[PDB]
Design a protein around this ligand. Sequence first.
Ligand SMILES: Nc1ncnc2c1ncn2[C@@H]1O[C@H](COP(=O)(O)OP(=O)(O)OP(=O)(O)O)[C@@H](O)[C@H]1O
Ligand SMILES: [Mg+2]
Lengths: 116, 116, 116, 57, 267, 144, 292, 43, 128
Amino acid sequence: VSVVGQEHYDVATGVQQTLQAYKSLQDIIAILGMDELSEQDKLTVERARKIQRFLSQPFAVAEVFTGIEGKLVRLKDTIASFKAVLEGKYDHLPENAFYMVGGIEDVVAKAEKIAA
Amino acid sequence: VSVVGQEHYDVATGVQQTLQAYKSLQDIIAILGMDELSEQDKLTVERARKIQRFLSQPFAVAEVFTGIEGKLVRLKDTIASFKAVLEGKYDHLPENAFYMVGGIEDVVAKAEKIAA
Amino acid sequence: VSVVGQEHYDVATGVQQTLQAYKSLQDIIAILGMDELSEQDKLTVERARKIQRFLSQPFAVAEVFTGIEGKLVRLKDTIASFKAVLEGKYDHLPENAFYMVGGIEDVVAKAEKIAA
Amino acid sequence: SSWQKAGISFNKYLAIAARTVQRSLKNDLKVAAEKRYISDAKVQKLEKVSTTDLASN
Amino acid sequence: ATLREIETRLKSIKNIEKITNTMKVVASTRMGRAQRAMASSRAFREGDSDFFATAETSTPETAEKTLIIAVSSDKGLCGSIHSQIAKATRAKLQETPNADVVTIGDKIKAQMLRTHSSNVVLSFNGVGKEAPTFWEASLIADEIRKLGDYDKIEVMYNKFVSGVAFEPSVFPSFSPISIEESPKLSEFELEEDQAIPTSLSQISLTNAILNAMAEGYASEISARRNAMDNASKNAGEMINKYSILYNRTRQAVITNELVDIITGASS
Amino acid sequence: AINVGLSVSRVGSAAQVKAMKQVAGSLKLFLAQYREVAAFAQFGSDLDASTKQTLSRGERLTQLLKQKQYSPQASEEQVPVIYAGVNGFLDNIPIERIPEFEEQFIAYLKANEGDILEAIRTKGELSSELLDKLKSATETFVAT
Amino acid sequence: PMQTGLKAVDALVPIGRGQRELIIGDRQTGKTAVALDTILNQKRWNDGNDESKKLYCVYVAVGQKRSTVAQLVQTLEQNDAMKYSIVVAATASEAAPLQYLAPFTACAIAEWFRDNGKHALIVYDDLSKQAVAYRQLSLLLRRPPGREAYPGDVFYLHSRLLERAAKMSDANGGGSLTALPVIETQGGDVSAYIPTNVISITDGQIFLEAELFYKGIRPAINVGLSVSRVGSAAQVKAMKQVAGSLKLFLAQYREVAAFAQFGSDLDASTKQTLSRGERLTQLLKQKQYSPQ
Amino acid sequence: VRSSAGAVRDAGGAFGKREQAEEERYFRARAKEQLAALKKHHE
Amino acid sequence: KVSLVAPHQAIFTNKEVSQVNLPASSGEMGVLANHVPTVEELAPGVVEVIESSGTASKYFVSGGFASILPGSKLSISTVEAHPLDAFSSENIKSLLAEAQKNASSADETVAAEAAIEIEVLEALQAAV
Ligand SMILES: Nc1ncnc2c1ncn2[C@@H]1O[C@H](COP(=O)(O)OP(=O)(O)OP(=O)(O)O)[C@@H](O)[C@H]1O
Ligand SMILES: [Mg+2]
């Protein structure tokens, strides 16, 4: 928090805590299923899947293997997009709208084109 | 049965059979729950938890880590207390009255003081 | 098909497909019965029981354990008997007429002598 | 018949008449019949998520 | 990922596969006995309740909100049993959120408290263990906290449309003021001096609750058999993948231990 | 990340001060009870009215003990923070305000009731007079 | 037929004269208990006059301590069983050459009775202690090692001493020799280095688990893991009639034993197999030093 | 393949932690009903 | 054409009957080929259904509501419907003797429930 600030330190701790809870409970998700969870464990599993695909951006050198354009997100745009998805502002969007995209601007444009 | 007697041989075999049967029934409760247990399986789960905590007594050299005083039980008091709990004479008592106690005299005094 | 011919490759593929479908459907027949199926599933299940016992012929050295004579079926007689049972020429025969037999001539003599 | 003299409705009157006729018939023919007249269900009225005294029977 | 960690994971996965396979075989035997109770309840809904179809009994305007009754179970491990019942009751409560909810199970009351905790007015536990009978449906209808003072009374449950899947259906229940105001209600020789309007309305609530509990129990038992078979099949694929990793780790442990004794003896 | 169920000390309570051992005498037992009750919230159980006080006090005690880098505390500031979290005085506060409550409680005890902070560092213990003064100052400081 | 005295050994895996029955198991699970009960049960035939029915025991204690060898010899003398039983004392406090040659020295003394017209029974206790003594002398003699810190002749050292205990024909004298090697496993793993070599060379192995010994099975003998290669050819005709029907009922009750926790959902065929399978397993449980 | 006597609690993973939390939650609820009934019977 | 469907099994189910006489609350009325719509309450009597000739099956109904439709349909919905040969004469005397002694002996609904059980047991024992 002394090099990246107080805003960037809270977003990094919140994103890592959601991914660690879904990975430890994978033995009940792959055996019993996703219906064996409670009300609090169900919302954390859906947000962890969308946060893992949003961090994977398509590079400019891998345009021939993926087919999409290269996305270069800045440091200020990446911290604002991760904090809004963890607060409940992007819970109605699908999980495929954030895969292979940029920041918060590319996630809203991909969800509107897939629903048309 | 020829060194400790016929009375001490039945108490050692009965305590080992109840502790070994609780390990097989604990695996079904983690996937199905407590609804699969009948009347005999429900009483065996409560008797196995109180018998494991009754054998753990506070040592005299470990008084700085536990806090309580050291208790020393004799050979005749330990065989009489284990045979009465396996028959159904201490089924109404809780599991906290036998934890960190001595023989049959310390288990009855801890149950009346915790309820007041 | 390039070592045994086109005729032997078609008979081996048809017998392996009927035996694989009947083995995987054994878990559903024990929980849903034998009459809760379609028209195509009922005809394939009746032919798979007789085809599994037709390939088990009695050897010449094992006549003192089963009581039946030793049958030595050739390569041309085994391919002609398996192709006629899969086409519907032996659908009216019993399931016990093909057990402990070898060849197409042994199935016709055992079925006519079982009833009369 | 006697539904106006008692405080029970038509739902409770049908269960009391069927249970009495089953116990007054053949005693040996009571196989798989005593479970329909005995239940261990409970009822508890909630308010606001607290509830009052839970009843039995 | 050593030898002791692979043995504990393989032994624990084998015990879960045996418990899942035994639960699926026990669910197949209980589904046969439950089929007779579900088939008997369907005959009562078409014979005893046939007077409402010939008289055209329907509701009209709302009178002091309404009343909802969610029939479910108290145990889990049944797949999407509690998720399908809570999603059907939440969609119909959008146009009338002032109505009360009467949960008849621990699974339906837990999901409804996270969205509409103020709408829950009745909670009944202990009904999903054994089979439903006429004594359990008659006791919940008489103690529903004024059930006859509502215009519309719905019974949310799960209807087993097939022997593998199910769907969440709903059945309405008329009150005493709506049974006597039907179109062809005067065609039957009914006594107006005795209790005929209030008796036919109270008997329909216990009859519909017995049919919804019998259909919901058969649908929950059928859904539990599919979840137990999927858990047993998923455990077999995980045990096969763990066996390949344990076989490679056992061969690598023997080669690493033999290389350490050969290096020290040659120096 | 210090695991209470794995890390232990062979010296026991003899290598600690008498002031921290009196206000936090049940700190080792509260960590084992709060770990078993935290896993029950992810199963669907919402009952247990008697276990609501222990489940709420275990979450506030773990966040208050987590300090930042290069921010060590003395024996006088750690004895007042452990007494308000073990006696139930921090159960009525929020979980997000656990960081701001530690700085506000240490600043008010250095300018108003400075005699209680100097007695816990010089003597290193708390008798009957020190226990009554610390409990009354912690209850009145919770209401702003 | 080799009368062992146990009800679960004489009906399931029945051992005969001339075969090699392994006694696998973990620590304190019924390893030496099966070998001691079989040697003490031969008092009904050795005290008579029939020389073909008697069987001289040959307990070869290798790897045990000094207190374990004195306690086993005192129990056999009180029941009149030490007069016709050879005792090969080989403690672990001696050299490595004395413990490794204990299996070869005990087999040569017991072979004199089989070559004359009598029967013998060797009990190599244990097979795991004999393999550690042979690898200690080979590592100090400047030799290359192999798997699990053993020499190249690891499989040939145990197969050569176990193949000599066979049943001769009528032209050689008519004698036989039994080999009862106890394989001390680690933690129930029967597919180890020294465990797999002794099970593949012997004609049968008796497994002993530590979970069945604490439940009530005395001794813990798994019917689904222990089997005999001789079958019913080396048994009595009176006991073979009752062992045929009990083998099918014990195998079907083991696979359907998971339905015992739900007794309220049993059918007609499920209730008959559970009641008959529980009474057959409890009747074969015998006490210590109480052979039938 | 065999020897699965208590392998769920001996692992210490997801199934091991859920078994200990389920047994501790059921024993804590039953102890409150047993302590309240014993105090009322003594007076 | 009858529809005697109970809450356990189906008796008539399909329309394949002629005449049926069931004891109602007013009197012992019997339905013919196409009875009029007279849906009345059924009392605890005997519900016999004549099958063409003399193949009638006496079914002792526990009471219900004999509903008749206008399209030649008779729906006799009852709680319990058992035959006359499924009851014993020795076991029926124990329930009738216990209900008479318990009547007018206590309060609440104990005395009111004993009067209804004594009247239903006396009518079934007289039709043997
Ligand atoms: N069937 C049985 N019933 C009762 N007790 C038994 C039985 N089998 C063995 N025991 C007990 O087990 C103890 C050890 O038996 P045994 O000598 O066969 O094994 P062990 O050689 O001690 O095993 P280890 O070498 O691993 O220590 C004996 O003291 C005996 O009392
Ligand atoms: Mg031994």
